[PDB]
Design a protein around this ligand. Structure first.
Ligand SMILES: *CC[C@H]1/C(=C/c2[nH]c(/C=C3N=C(/C=C4\NC(=O)C(CC)=C4C)C(C)=C\3CCC(=O)O)c(CCC(=O)O)c2C)NC(=O)[C@@H]1C
Ligand SMILES: *CC[C@H]1/C(=C/c2[nH]c(/C=C3N=C(/C=C4\NC(=O)C(CC)=C4C)C(C)=C\3CCC(=O)O)c(CCC(=O)O)c2C)NC(=O)[C@@H]1C
Ligand SMILES: *CC[C@H]1/C(=C/c2[nH]c(/C=C3N=C(/C=C4\NC(=O)C(CC)=C4C)C(C)=C\3CCC(=O)O)c(CCC(=O)O)c2C)NC(=O)[C@@H]1C
Ligand SMILES: *CC[C@H]1/C(=C/c2[nH]c(/C=C3N=C(/C=C4\NC(=O)C(CC)=C4C)C(C)=C\3CCC(=O)O)c(CCC(=O)O)c2C)NC(=O)[C@@H]1C
Ligand SMILES: *CC[C@H]1/C(=C/c2[nH]c(/C=C3N=C(/C=C4\NC(=O)C(CC)=C4C)C(C)=C\3CCC(=O)O)c(CCC(=O)O)c2C)NC(=O)[C@@H]1C
Ligand SMILES: *CC[C@H]1/C(=C/c2[nH]c(/C=C3N=C(/C=C4\NC(=O)C(CC)=C4C)C(C)=C\3CCC(=O)O)c(CCC(=O)O)c2C)NC(=O)[C@@H]1C
Ligand SMILES: *CC[C@H]1/C(=C/c2[nH]c(/C=C3N=C(/C=C4\NC(=O)C(CC)=C4C)C(C)=C\3CCC(=O)O)c(CCC(=O)O)c2C)NC(=O)[C@@H]1C
Ligand SMILES: C=CC1=C(C)[C@@H](Cc2[nH]c(/C=C3N=C(/C=C4\NC(=O)[C@H](C)[C@H]4CC)C(C)=C\3CCC(=O)O)c(CCC(=O)O)c2C)NC1=O
Ligand SMILES: C=CC1=C(C)[C@@H](Cc2[nH]c(/C=C3N=C(/C=C4\NC(=O)[C@H](C)[C@H]4CC)C(C)=C\3CCC(=O)O)c(CCC(=O)O)c2C)NC1=O
Ligand SMILES: C=CC1=C(C)[C@@H](Cc2[nH]c(/C=C3N=C(/C=C4\NC(=O)[C@H](C)[C@H]4CC)C(C)=C\3CCC(=O)O)c(CCC(=O)O)c2C)NC1=O
Ligand SMILES: C=CC1=C(C)[C@@H](Cc2[nH]c(/C=C3N=C(/C=C4\NC(=O)[C@H](C)[C@H]4CC)C(C)=C\3CCC(=O)O)c(CCC(=O)O)c2C)NC1=O
Lengths: 118, 162, 231, 172, 162, 162, 172, 172, 172
């Protein structure tokens, strides 16, 4: 069908309904009255994070070349990482909720819950 | 932390007051000083692997009993030498963090809080790390106020170790 | 003569000692009169005592006591006597005491004077009896004369929330002014003249809250782009 | 609490990693707009009383159920509580503006605020209205060119609006 | 006071700690800002007698009932006009003190502490002084960051009056 | 509140003691005074709509700039006149509540707590309400100790406004 | 806390209403029985020790499982706690009697009392028995004609019994 | 808190019972091993530093994910927190050893400890490992015959191991 | 507390005087030596441990009656009290050095110090010796040219020595 191909499914646009109070962000005055915040990093302001900070290149230089000492694939995740980016508050975009995660449901290989179940 | 930014925010929040022109000048003084200390941290990062091994060798030259005395606290075997190089890397990394933050915020958070508890429990003397820090202070090859920015955070760690 | 009944301890941040030689910026500015303040800084000490014991909220003018202040800056009374004057104060006795039972009021007074949370429910139930049988005066005397208050604040330091945040971490414990407001979920529905208990968000036809997309020119807003100095 | 430099420092520490050179340019361009960052908070601080008072005045002109008898702003003390609640948010947003990130806003202003208003019976959606009325009032004032050199500071204005948005959805 | 110097000393004394590199940058930011605010105060000092009478006349033009209504709170007689000019001089003098100190230290010490007690007891409205301060903010004739230094301490007093 | 009843209960509860004959006489003095103040409140209720508009007109006659000066704080348009009449009604209603409660209980929790804040934030002078309360004090048409009961709670509000 | 006058004052304020003349009729007849109201609280106050002691004595004569070993009144300190718990309720009922309504009884005596006894393991039904034993002891004493002029005060006696009933069902 | 004598006293009080003669022999044989009870706590107290330090050293030799960067013992202050957390448990176990029962261990050491480690993100199973590493380090040291008359004290050693087990399952 | 700018501001306020132009040059030349003022306190802060330790070591080499048994430094806690007393004075002298005047030194360090040492039995003349031993240890270190541009800062060195002298005569 080609590259630039129209689909109703992929049309997030108010062209089929004429809601004329909805437009692309444009003026500097638009941040106070109509627009809220980018919902992802592709929609972010040029060269800044989704929250408005300058984007930094995400990775450093590994000190301490060592398999037993030194950071590796076995190292545990420091809890202050999620605190630094603000993912620990429920009003943050990256706030994880584990109550509806697939990981929270019961294993079925476990014989115990299976016989409890049948 | 003890960034100038957080220090200025804490006083104004403790008055329960807005950010006056007092705190803005305190932030401006951090800003016009960062262009000297960020070059210091960039220079210390690239010079790191030389400085770590040089400091570790200077410690063994100053205290040669540390490589010969048997025991878990000494660098007599290979695990002890690896742990010693790891500790010198920790100190240099904290110095580079304090350089780009501005002020001794990271190293009070990571190094000095509970340090002599570690040195007394794991039975290791603080004179070794002083000798290691003196080598880094003497041989980073910096000058101007770049060296002044580096040596302040070096001598802070020397003062807390002594 | 009815001693106070025993409760068990819990695990809290202040029961353990922090190591922290050379602390960070989460120190809460110990407001002592042993630093010999000026007339400028005794106003800050008075304001911090108003902020700790009263909320941020009753630092209105009908709540301010000009006479405990004038006796504090003449060294007639100490800071501990100033806190005792503020808890037994007259706007505190109708904006925090008439709107609680004896159980919520004791956790208010433990959180704001002792600078710590309660240990469990049994501590609230245990200390609740002193208020009823001795008045607020007897309750605040036996609270201010504990070993816990004297070992931490003494007679000359404004109390504060002791050891709120862990020092690595950003998120710490909720501040006690936000954790316990003036009244709770009880007492409010008919007695404190509060109604409807919740709020659906405000609906409107001009939306004002839409997220910008990836091709909008507002993302590339810019001005005065190149200096072009000289030749 | 953390500012924007200490945040990437905590990221790099919790991974034991030296800061790469590209992160140093990411910090140098935050240093580059230091005067423009300071001008915004200076302009907000110089107009802080008129921001809160005009936003509060326009709130009750369109939501008159609050100041009529029975409302949650019908007293002199509930009304003074409302004005001082608005100053609190304007204070902590300006703290987060010079910090560079919203740690101090999230940490000691917004944490537990929704539960507080639910316990008091305060309508949180009307708090959210007043916060966005202060937001556009401060944004249009931060685009004023009096007393400043000729230039671009639009990305900082979007960053300032983001903090008001974060405080607005944190209270409903 | 709220000089940056005293603010930096108070935090370090409250840690019980020496003056680190945190507070030195806060002092350095006051130092490299004073060369703009001292010229502002020098300019406001020489322009003072014009600005006082201009602000007092602007108040009478904005509120003409203040010169006609009889009573001790109003500038209907000569003693009231003298006291009004005295008060405008007080406000301008406190602004010039805050300019050379750096930060609102003097005017919290002298003006704003106990001010609405005075305004309520002596029965005088704060809108007059706001109108007077707006004239001084509009007609000091400064520019650059000199005007930025002046207008910050003008608008601080306007915010505390409102 | 500050009813005599609640005042007597608070002291006895603060001793942790029963209601002795001290507090019973305090309650009895409220009881034998209420038959004078309840007639005052009944008379002020029926005379209300006249007194409100009379006081609002007296304020505009005393301060004629309030109807001519443009701005949101003044009664220049219709919404300002409606809000002014609303405020005078609030003051008269609080006086009538204090009349049958006995003692300044209602108006301290409703009017005076946080009133200086409202008057400074919303830009409005307390002399207008003093002028309005003087009209009500002069023209309620009461006599005997009925007028004595009314004027005490009028002058309480005048004292807290000044 | 509120008395009976402040209660309808709050009713009339929260709808912004002037007090009608009929409500002034309703308040003047409360003024009319002031001496008879004061006469009761006086008789309860001068007999307060014998009320609590005789009611407590008759409670364990018919519920002897409390003072036998293992019971919730088998100590000298649990027993002194029980007597002082009964004096608390007798105190706050007499406060509500001169207030005219049960705001101070509900507010700082009964709020959270059932949960307290559930946390301690105290049987709340036996507290309810002791409260009604004080109730009839004080009611029969408030119908004594010694030291008072001859008249009718029966509606006030029913109002006094209502507070004891409200405290009785509040702790089960 | 209670010791072993006060515990049977509370048992006998809460049913109002005189202590039988057989309970007096049960207490006399606790008196009989008093010197042997004191020797154990004396030997643990004299080696308390080397117990904690060797157990902590052997913990990170086999769980090296804790002291590597990102771990919950990667600081100098989290590490000093860990050593001092181990000394706390060694202190309260030795308190319970001379008390005869685990009231003071359960009451002001273990109550709320699992929830604390869950709130902090500390792995409680690795705390349970370190507690059992202190356990047999102290048990093998309490079976040392230097400085004591030679005799039997094995039941006391099992009682000492029981407290370490109780503290171990209390924190997972 | 006051710095040097706030001191002349208090002088000018307490007579209601506008600041003359000559006082503005007096303040501008204090601004002129700001970097040289900061270098001194930076060099003292970087050597603060070796200042106190070497001065204290040289004090007991020549006054050995203090550390011998019976002396006022014969303990480990009286000795640690002495070292920490010397750090206090070195701290507050450095505070006064960046303040420009000795208000914070006189106000919250030296006020009541002579009476304290008289109440404790501490010999104040030996404190005065140790203060002057720290004085030239810091003065000879502030004349070091390593890490600074070569220039004149001698008047600031005399100002620094004045604070040590003021603290020395305040303690006898
Ligand atoms: C210069 C090398 C000398 C030396 C090193 C050595 N160190 C250890 C053990 C530890 N060192 C630390 C110190 C830190 N850990 C940190 O995370 C930080 C910064 C936040 C510091 C400063 C700690 C906690 C330990 C114990 C855990 C560990 O890392 O293994 C050892 C081993 C000691 C022992 O096994 O008991 C050595 C040998 N010692 C020397 O001999 C060199 C001179
Ligand atoms: C625009 C006004 C809105 C409004 C405000 C309102 N708030 C309260 C009460 C409280 N608000 C807080 C919030 C904070 N306290 C803090 O310390 C901080 C700093 C981080 C915040 C954000 C708290 C704790 C309370 C309860 C304490 C108190 O009583 O003041 C009230 C009620 C006051 C009262 O009932 O006495 C109001 C009216 N309510 C509105 O309707 C507006 C939308
Ligand atoms: C613009 C003139 C308007 C005006 C002035 C006026 N003021 C007063 C009286 C006082 N003003 C003050 C204010 C200050 N005193 C201070 O020392 C300071 C700074 C530290 C301030 C801001 C005080 C204390 C008084 C009372 C004592 C006095 O100075 O006389 C008066 C006289 C009021 C009276 O007599 O009751 C007038 C007339 N009023 C106007 O009408 C002008 C618009
Ligand atoms: C005599 C009329 C004068 C006048 C009145 C005026 N008032 C306002 C605004 C407010 N007035 C109040 C005062 C109260 N509210 C209460 O609930 C109570 C008793 C519990 C009092 C005393 C408040 C809170 C406001 C602001 C909210 C509101 O009611 O609208 C205004 C409007 C001011 C503005 O829009 O900023 C006017 C005009 N002003 C005059 O000019 C008359 C002389
Ligand atoms: C007739 C005796 C009944 C009884 C009483 C009993 N009560 C307690 C313990 C408490 N009672 C309270 C109740 C109040 N405290 C107050 O301050 C007020 C004023 C509003 C009331 C109504 C509280 C808080 C406690 C716990 C505090 C305490 O320990 O005293 C006890 C137990 C005492 C103890 O266990 O040490 C008893 C025995 N119990 C009965 O069996 C009778 C029916
Ligand atoms: C072997 C080390 C293990 C470990 C320890 C660890 N603990 C903490 C933090 C806390 N531990 C407690 C526990 C107690 N506090 C008490 O007062 C008592 C006496 C009854 C006990 C048992 C508490 C309250 C805290 C939080 C307070 C604090 O911050 O210190 C920490 C974290 C310290 C920090 O984050 O700053 C560690 C690392 N963790 C491990 O990984 C080891 C298994
Ligand atoms: C070089 C050591 C000299 C010495 C010191 C010494 N001092 C003390 C006791 C105290 N010193 C102070 C002084 C201060 N306290 C402060 O908070 C401040 C800050 C402004 C100062 C300057 C105080 C209050 C005491 C008493 C409190 C205490 O006991 O520590 C002691 C005695 C300690 C003791 O007896 O336990 C010594 C030995 N004494 C010498 O001989 C040296 C000359
Ligand atoms: C005393 C406290 C204190 C401050 C308030 C700042 C203020 C300040 N800002 C600028 C300098 C500037 N300030 C701004 C900011 C703005 N310009 C605009 O047109 C917008 C209205 C607004 C954006 C938010 C910009 C954009 C520049 C650089 C000029 C340019 O390139 O456009 C300068 C000159 C130095 C420079 O070139 O950077 C100063 C001193 N600095 C301080 O020390
Ligand atoms: C010092 C504290 C103090 C008091 C205790 C009261 C007591 C008091 N009560 C009455 C007066 C009265 N007291 C009562 C009450 C009673 N009569 C009975 O027969 C019943 C046993 C009981 C009902 C509960 C009645 C009914 C009257 C009015 C006489 C009547 O009309 O029957 C009077 C005479 C004044 C009058 O006529 O009202 C006084 C002084 N007043 C006080 O100042
Ligand atoms: C100053 C503090 C203080 C102490 C530490 C104790 C120590 C102590 N223990 C014993 C006496 C004893 N101590 C022990 C204990 C032991 N023996 C062993 O072989 C095991 C290694 C260990 C078991 C845990 C035993 C078993 C006896 C009695 C000897 C026997 O019958 O075997 C005695 C001699 C008195 C007696 O016969 O009971 C003393 C003084 N008493 C004190 O006052
Ligand atoms: C980060 C914290 C911080 C500091 C520590 C200072 C340090 C500092 N000092 C100087 C600059 C200077 N510093 C000194 C001081 C001295 N030179 C000597 O030879 C003596 C040993 C010593 C006297 C006490 C002098 C004298 C100058 C000016 C050079 C001269 O004219 O001699 C400069 C260059 C700028 C200038 O020319 O003034 C800087 C950056 N500034 C800061 O921001």
């Amino acid at each position: 069908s080609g590259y630039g191909d129209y689909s109703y499914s992929t049309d997030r646009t108010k062209g089929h309904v004429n809601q004329y109070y909805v437009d692309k962000a444009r003026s500097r005055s638009d941040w106070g009255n109509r627009n809220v915040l980018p919902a992802s990093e592709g929609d972010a302001v040029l060269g800044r994070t989704a929250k408005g900070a300058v984007a930094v290149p995400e990775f450093g230089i590994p000190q301490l070349d060592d398999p037993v000492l030194g950071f590796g694939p076995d190292s545990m995740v420091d809890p202050r990482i999620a605190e630094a980016d603000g993912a620990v508050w429920r009003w943050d975009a990256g706030f994880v909720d584990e109550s509806m995660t697939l990981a929270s449901c019961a294993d079925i290989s476990d014989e115990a819950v299976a016989d409890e179940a049948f | 932390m003890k960034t100038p930014i957080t220090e200025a925010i804490a006083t104004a929040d403790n008055q329960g007051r807005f950010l006056s022109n007092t705190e803005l000048q305190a932030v401006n003084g951090r800003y016009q000083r960062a262009t000297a200390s960020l070059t210091a941290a960039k220079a210390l990062t690239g010079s790191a692997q030389r400085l770590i091994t040089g400091a570790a060798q200077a410690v063994y030259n100053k205290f040669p009993y540390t490589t010969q005395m048997p025991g878990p606290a000494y660098a007599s075997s290979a695990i002890g030498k690896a742990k010693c190089a790891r500790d010198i890397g920790y100190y240099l990394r904290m110095v580079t963090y304090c350089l780009v933050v501005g002020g001794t915020g990271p190293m009070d958070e990571y190094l000095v809080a509970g340090l002599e508890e570690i040195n007394r429990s794991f039975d290791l003397s603080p004179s070794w790390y002083i000798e290691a820090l003196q080598y880094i202070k003497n041989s980073h090859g910096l000058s101007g106020q770049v060296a002044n920015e580096a040596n302040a955070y070096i001598d802070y760690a020397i003062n807390t170790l002594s | 003569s009815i001693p106070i009944l025993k409760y068990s301890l819990s695990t809290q941040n202040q029961r353990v000692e922090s190591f922290e030689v050379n602390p960070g910026d989460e120190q809460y500015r110990i407001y002592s009169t042993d630093s010999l303040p000026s007339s400028s800084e005794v106003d800050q000490i008075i304001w911090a005592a108003y902020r700790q014991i009263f909320s941020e909220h009753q630092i209105l003018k009908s709540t301010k006591q000009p006479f405990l202040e004038s006796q504090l800056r003449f060294n007639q009374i100490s800071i501990k006597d100033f806190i005792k004057g503020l808890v037994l104060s007259a706007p505190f006795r109708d904006l925090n005491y008439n709107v609680n039972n004896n159980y919520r009021f004791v956790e208010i007074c433990v959180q704001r004077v002792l600078g710590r949370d309660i240990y469990n429910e049994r501590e609230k139930i245990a200390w609740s009896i002193i208020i009823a049988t001795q008045g607020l005066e007897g309750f605040i005397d036996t609270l201010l004369n504990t070993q816990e208050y004297l070992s931490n604040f003494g007679d000359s330091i404004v109390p504060f929330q002791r050891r709120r945040i862990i020092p690595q971490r950003s998120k710490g414990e909720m501040p006690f002014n936000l954790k316990t407001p003036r009244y709770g979920i009880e007492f409010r529905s008919k007695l404190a003249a509060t109604q409807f208990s919740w709020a659906s968000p405000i609906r409107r036809f001009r939306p004002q809250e839409q997220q910008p997309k990836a091709g909008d020119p507002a993302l590339f807003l810019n001005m005065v782009q190149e200096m072009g100095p000289g030749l | 609490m953390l500012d924007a430099f200490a945040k990437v420092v905590a990221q790099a520490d919790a991974r034991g990693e030296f800061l790469s050179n590209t992160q140093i340019d990411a910090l140098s361009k935050m240093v580059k707009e230091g005067n423009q960052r300071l001008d915004i908070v200076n302009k907000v601080t110089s107009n802080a009383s008129a921001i809160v008072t005009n936003s509060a005045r326009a709130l009750f002109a369109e939501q008159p159920q609050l100041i009529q008898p029975g409302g949650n702003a019908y007293t002199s003390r509930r009304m003074a509580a409302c004005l001082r609640d608005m100053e609190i948010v304007l204070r902590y947003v300006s703290y987060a503006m010079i910090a560079g990130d919203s740690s101090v806003l999230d940490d000691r202003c917004l944490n537990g605020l929704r539960e507080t208003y639910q316990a008091l019976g305060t309508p949180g959606s009307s708090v959210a209205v007043a916060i966005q009325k202060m937001k556009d009032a401060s944004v249009a004032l931060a685009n004023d060119t009096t007393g400043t050199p000729i230039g671009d500071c639009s990305s900082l204005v979007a960053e300032l609006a983001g903090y008001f948005d974060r405080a607005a959805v944190s209270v409903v």
